[PDB]
């Protein structure tokens, strides 16, 4: 059964992958080899070419991602060789440095050994490799509420945060055979952060806002031809609205709109003044300006949607079905100013792809 599903997924992936790589003639013999490997071993091992192309296909098939035009330039790092926690740490440190690239962000994925019997070899606890801690006790809220449960789990393990609003969480992961994860503080020299200033409004710096340069999502599973890479952190560059309309704006995140309204000099008293909307726009302008000024890659939602339109055109021209999740593709500010809002998308799930998986804490 288990063995059956794997073979099926393998046939479908190898056929499609080799077709796109112009290697269609090599399919029959590769499939032969795979069949034997599965019979003999219970699993099979991707070639470097298969793994690289699979990770790229998986990004291409990510319905919720507006940034897919660049799927084929994904930088894929093969770390299936790691066996120790020092190696995993160093690979994660390396991913941060190489993806950051002094501000000129390279979309990158680092791929660790896959689940074996559904048994994880490496289990990453972080949601993103770089993220801020959150605390909630005695009515006191500090940092990022979205990080409260992971922060509490880290502190169970002997980590202690300084309780600023921007404590960097340690890297935290567990190896097969260890009962507990280990944690490592991030070297601050590896982590680019951007202070938020406004191009016109000088008081904006009074808010003392900042955000980190690179979102490196580290808790999703990459599935390629029936092989489950549960540990495979990847990154792009930010779209500005993720920071300005959600991370810094949401009431359940940093909740900064009233403070923004105050520093930009507008009242926050009447819904009809659209003060939240006006605050959102200025905060989002501040975020784009600040990343650009520091030389850290970022895309605004208009440019991003323009790129996505080209992705749609490229899909059509290549003869591939396009899939998408309208509810995630539309940006959270001025969505009707983008073409995405005015059409519909088929939300079918195509593999390879990235999937959610259960958290090991909570």
Ligand X SMILES: CNCCc1cccc(OCc2ccc3ccc(N)nc3c2)c1
- Max Cα separation, the chain? 71
Q: Is 148 annotated as a binding residue?
A: no
Active-site residue identified among 17, 50, 59, 65: 65
Rounded Cα distance, 21 and 206, in Å = 53
Between the alpha carbon of residue 271 and those of residues 98, 268, 274, 276, the distances in Å are 45, 8, 6, 8
> Half-sphere exposure of residue 118, counting CA atoms within 13 Å on the CB side?
5
Of 310, 359, 304, 312, nearest in space to 337 by CA: 304
Q: Which residues inside 41-80 make contact with a second copy, applying CB under 8 A?
A: none
Q: Which residues inside 318-337 make contact with a second copy, applying CB under 8 A?
A: 326-327, 330, 332-337
Beta carbons of 308 and 69 less than 8 angstroms apart: yes
Minimum separation from the CB atom of position 37 to ligand X (A): 32
Nearer to Cl ion, 222 or 245 (CB): 245
Whether residue 242 lies in the annotated active site:
yes
Rounded Cα distance, 316 and 293, in Å = 37
What is the sign, positive or negative, of the torsion defined by CA atoms of 292, 294, 295, 298? negative
Beta-ladder partners of 26: none
Beta carbons of 174 and 360 less than 8 angstroms apart: yes
Residue 104 contact partner, candidates ligand HEM, a second copy, Cl ion, none, CB within 5 to 8 A by sort of partner:
none
Q: Site for Cl ion (CB under 5 A): which residue of 215, 225, 236, 244?
A: 215
Beta carbons of 329 and 309 less than 8 angstroms apart: no
Part of the chain binding a second copy (CB under 8 A), chosen from 97-105, 204-212, 222-230, 273-281? 273-281
Part of the chain binding ligand HEM (CB under 6 A), chosen from 16-24, 29-37, 64-72, 205-213? 64-72
**Per-residue x/- track, 324-353, ligand HEM (CB under 6 A):** ----x-------------------------
Rounded Cα distance, 187 and 153, in Å = 21
Part of the chain binding ligand X (CB under 6 A), chosen from 26-34, 75-83, 155-163, 234-242? 234-242
Part of the chain binding ligand X (CB under 6 A), chosen from 46-54, 177-185, 238-246, 304-312? 238-246
Minimum separation from the CB atom of position 242 to Cl ion (A): 5
Minimum separation from the CB atom of position 299 to ligand HEM (A): 5
Rounded Cα distance, 218 and 215, in Å = 9
Beta carbons of 245 and 277 less than 8 angstroms apart: no
Cis link prior to 97 (omega < 30° from 0)? no
- Tell me the site size for a second copy, rule CB under 8 A: 33
Binding site for a second copy (CB under 8 A): 245-246, 249-250, 257, 271-274, 276-278, 280-281, 284-285, 288-289, 292, 300, 302-303, 306, 326-327, 330, 332-337, 341
**Catalytically annotated residues:** 65, 68, 237, 242
Query: Which chain residues interact with ligand X by CB under 6 A?
Result: 67, 215, 217, 219-220, 236, 238-239, 242
């Amino acid at each position: 059964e288990e063995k059956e599903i794997l073979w099926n997924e393998a046939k479908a992936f190898i056929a499609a992958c080799y077709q796109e790589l112009g290697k269609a003639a090599e399919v029959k013999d590769r499939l032969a080899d795979i069949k034997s490997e599965i019979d003999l071993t219970g699993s099979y091992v991707h070639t470097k070419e298969e793994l690289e192309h699979g990770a790229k296909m998986a990004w291409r098939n990510s319905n919720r991602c507006i940034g897919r035009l660049f799927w084929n330039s994904l930088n894929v790092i093969d770390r299936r060789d790691v066996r120790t926690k020092e190696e995993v740490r160093d690979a994660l440190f390396h991913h941060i440095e190489t993806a950051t690239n002094n501000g000129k962000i390279r979309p990158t994925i680092t791929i660790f050994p896959p689940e074996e019997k559904g048994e994880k070899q490496v289990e990453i606890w972080n949601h993103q490799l770089i993220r801020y801690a959150g605390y909630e006790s005695d009515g006191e809220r500090i940092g990022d509420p979205a990080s409260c449960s992971l922060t509490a789990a880290c502190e169970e393990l002997g980590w202690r945060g300084e309780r600023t609003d921007f404590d960097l969480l340690p890297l935290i992961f567990r190896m097969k055979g260890d009962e507990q994860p280990v944690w490592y503080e991030l070297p601050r020299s590896l982590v680019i952060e951007v202070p938020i200033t406004h191009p016109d409004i000088e008081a904006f710096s009074d808010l003392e806002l900042k955000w980190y340069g690179v979102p490196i999502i580290s808790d999703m599973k990459l599935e390629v031809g029936g092989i489950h890479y549960n540990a495979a952190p990847f990154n792009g560059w930010y779209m500005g609205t993720e920071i300005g309309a959600r991370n810094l704006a949401d009431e359940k995140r940093y909740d900064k709109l009233k403070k923004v309204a105050s520093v930009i000099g507008i009242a926050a008293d009447y819904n009809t003044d659209l003060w939240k909307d006006q605050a959102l726009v200025e905060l989002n302008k501040a975020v784009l300006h600040s990343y650009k000024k520091q030389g850290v890659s970022i895309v605004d939602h208009h440019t991003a949607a323009s790129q996505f339109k080209r992705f749609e055109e490229q899909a059509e021209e290549a003869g591939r079905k396009l899939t998408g999740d309208w509810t995630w593709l539309i940006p959270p500010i001025s969505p009707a100013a983008t073409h995405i809002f005015h059409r519909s998308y088929d939300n079918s799930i195509v593999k390879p792809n990235y999937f959610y998986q259960d958290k090991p804490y909570e």
